[PDB]
Design an enzyme around this catalytic site. Structure first.
Site, short mmCIF file in Angstrom:
data_model
loop_
_atom_site.label_atom_id
_atom_site.label_comp_id
_atom_site.label_asym_id
_atom_site.label_seq_id
_atom_site.Cartn_x
_atom_site.Cartn_y
_atom_site.Cartn_z
N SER A 2 0.84 -1.21 0.00
CA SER A 2 0.00 0.00 0.00
C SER A 2 0.87 1.25 0.00
O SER A 2 0.50 2.22 -0.73
CB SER A 2 -1.02 -0.01 1.13
OG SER A 2 -2.07 -0.89 0.85
N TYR A 62 1.89 2.96 -3.23
CA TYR A 62 0.84 3.76 -3.91
C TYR A 62 0.81 5.21 -3.40
O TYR A 62 0.07 6.00 -3.97
CB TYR A 62 -0.52 3.08 -3.86
CG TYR A 62 -0.59 1.85 -4.73
CD1 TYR A 62 -0.81 1.97 -6.10
CD2 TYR A 62 -0.31 0.60 -4.22
CE1 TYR A 62 -0.81 0.85 -6.92
CE2 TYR A 62 -0.33 -0.53 -5.03
CZ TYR A 62 -0.60 -0.40 -6.38
OH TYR A 62 -0.65 -1.49 -7.18
N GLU A 76 -4.01 -9.09 -2.48
CA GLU A 76 -4.76 -7.82 -2.54
C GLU A 76 -6.24 -8.14 -2.47
O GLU A 76 -6.65 -9.30 -2.73
CB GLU A 76 -4.32 -6.97 -3.72
CG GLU A 76 -4.44 -7.62 -5.06
CD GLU A 76 -3.78 -6.75 -6.13
OE1 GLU A 76 -2.54 -6.63 -6.13
OE2 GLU A 76 -4.53 -6.14 -6.91
C1 LIG Z 1 -2.24 3.83 -21.18
O1 LIG Z 1 -2.73 2.49 -20.94
C2 LIG Z 1 -2.05 1.75 -20.07
O2 LIG Z 1 -1.15 1.02 -20.37
C3 LIG Z 1 -2.54 1.92 -18.67
C4 LIG Z 1 -2.05 1.17 -17.61
N1 LIG Z 1 -2.48 1.30 -16.35
C5 LIG Z 1 -3.42 2.23 -16.15
N2 LIG Z 1 -3.87 2.39 -14.89
C6 LIG Z 1 -3.33 1.65 -13.74
C7 LIG Z 1 -4.45 1.09 -12.88
N3 LIG Z 1 -5.39 2.15 -12.52
C8 LIG Z 1 -5.64 2.60 -11.29
O3 LIG Z 1 -6.23 3.63 -11.10
C9 LIG Z 1 -5.24 1.76 -10.13
C10 LIG Z 1 -4.58 2.41 -9.09
C11 LIG Z 1 -4.20 1.72 -7.96
C12 LIG Z 1 -4.47 0.37 -7.83
C13 LIG Z 1 -4.12 -0.32 -6.59
N4 LIG Z 1 -3.88 -1.65 -6.52
C14 LIG Z 1 -3.61 -1.94 -5.19
C15 LIG Z 1 -3.38 -3.15 -4.55
C16 LIG Z 1 -3.23 -3.12 -3.18
C17 LIG Z 1 -3.30 -1.92 -2.48
C18 LIG Z 1 -3.51 -0.71 -3.14
C19 LIG Z 1 -3.46 0.58 -2.38
N5 LIG Z 1 -3.73 1.72 -3.03
O4 LIG Z 1 -3.18 0.56 -1.16
C20 LIG Z 1 -3.69 -0.72 -4.53
N6 LIG Z 1 -4.01 0.29 -5.42
C21 LIG Z 1 -5.12 -0.29 -8.87
C22 LIG Z 1 -5.50 0.40 -10.01
C23 LIG Z 1 -5.96 2.80 -13.71
C24 LIG Z 1 -4.87 3.40 -14.54
N7 LIG Z 1 -3.97 3.02 -17.09
C25 LIG Z 1 -3.53 2.84 -18.34
#
Ligand SMILES: COC(=O)c1cnc(N2CCN(C(=O)c3ccc(-c4nc5cccc(C(N)=O)c5[nH]4)cc3)CC2)nc1
Ligand SMILES: OC[C@H]1O[C@@](CO)(O[C@H]2O[C@H](CO)[C@@H](O)[C@H](O)[C@H]2O)[C@@H](O)[C@@H]1O
Length: 241
Positions: A135, A138, A219
């Site tokens: 966490s 992040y 997670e």
């Molecule tokens: C441009 O296209 C891409 O390649 C691309 C790649 N990735 C994206 N994106 C990446 C995923 N996107 C998220 O907002 C996102 C943000 C955070 C997590 C997350 N996972 C966790 C697991 C355990 C704890 C925590 C915590 N905060 O304690 C976690 N937080 C998950 C998802 C959206 C954006 N967007 C685009």
């Protein structure tokens, strides 16, 4: 002349980076109290932080500066349906400091229906860890400002859909309330305790015995904002090595 305790004032200054401190406090629509450093709550939280630092997250160590007890307006009322659902867990959620004004005023939110699923390993939901370091990553904390904010939330997991591989969808089978992404490493379940009827998995990391998973650490994901009740906010020092 703010009547707030110094630690809360410093938290407000950190979140807003202006209006008087008390005007900014009111915008959070959140009761914020300082948890006593010598209290049982503080001791439990410090143990949870000490015990659940992942061995592969060795870029920094964490030190608890301040612990706050938080009550978002309306959030406990919203949580009532989930409040005695079996399997409630106290879990970490990290975020950029610049997001915390929004998180306290609006709570943790799910991406809108229009948003692409790209990069969401378990789809558009609210993500939590049982390892503080997973966490803390992040927070996107820099060496130049090595202070981060992390939440502890009561999460109503109910019946978990246990997955070893990414599924980018947000729809659960009937009777399932959450996803658990199964990690290679899990807090020792023989050290789990209850804090106000909620499981706190503050055991040291041991091998889960799960094979053929893509996750190092667990997670947990829920797909309804009402399944989360934020309980604590920690200000952490990141000591980079
Ligand atoms: C441009 O296209 C891409 O390649 C691309 C790649 N990735 C994206 N994106 C990446 C995923 N996107 C998220 O907002 C996102 C943000 C955070 C997590 C997350 N996972 C966790 C697991 C355990 C704890 C925590 C915590 N905060 O304690 C976690 N937080 C998950 C998802 C959206 C954006 N967007 C685009
Ligand atoms: O219940 C809250 C939340 O969980 C979801 C799945 O994300 O549905 C589960 O819970 C429902 C009500 O208890 C059940 O009807 C359903 O079978 C179960 O999957 C969401 O739909 C709901 O908002």
């Amino acid at each position: 002349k703010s009547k707030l305790p110094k630690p809360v004032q410093d938290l407000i200054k950190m979140i807003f980076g202006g209006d008087p401190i008390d005007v900014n406090y009111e915008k959070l629509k959140t009761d914020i109290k300082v948890v006593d450093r010598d209290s049982e709550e503080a001791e439990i939280i410090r143990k949870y932080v000490k015990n659940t630092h992942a061995t592969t997250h060795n870029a920094y160590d964490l030190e608890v500066i301040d612990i706050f007890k938080i009550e978002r307006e309306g959030e406990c009322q919203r949580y009532k349906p989930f409040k005695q659902l079996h399997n409630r867990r106290l879990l970490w959620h990290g975020s950029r400091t610049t997001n915390f004004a929004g998180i306290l005023s609006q709570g943790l939110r799910i991406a809108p229906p229009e948003a692409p699923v790209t990069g969401y390993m378990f789809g558009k939901g609210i993500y939590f860890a049982d390892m503080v370091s997973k966490s803390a990553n992040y927070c996107h904390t820099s060496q130049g400002d090595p202070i981060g904010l992390i939440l502890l939330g009561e999460v109503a997991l109910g019946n978990m859909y246990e997955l070893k591989h990414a599924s980018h969808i947000s729809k659960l089978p009937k009777g399932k309330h959450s996803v658990k992404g199964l990690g290679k490493t899990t807090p020792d379940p023989s050290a789990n305790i209850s804090l106000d009827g909620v499981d706190v998995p503050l055991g040291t990391g041991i091998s889960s015995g799960v094979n053929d998973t893509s996750l190092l650490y667990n997670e947990y994901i829920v797909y309804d904002i009402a399944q989360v009740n934020l309980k604590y906010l920690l200000k952490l020092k990141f000591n980079f090595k």
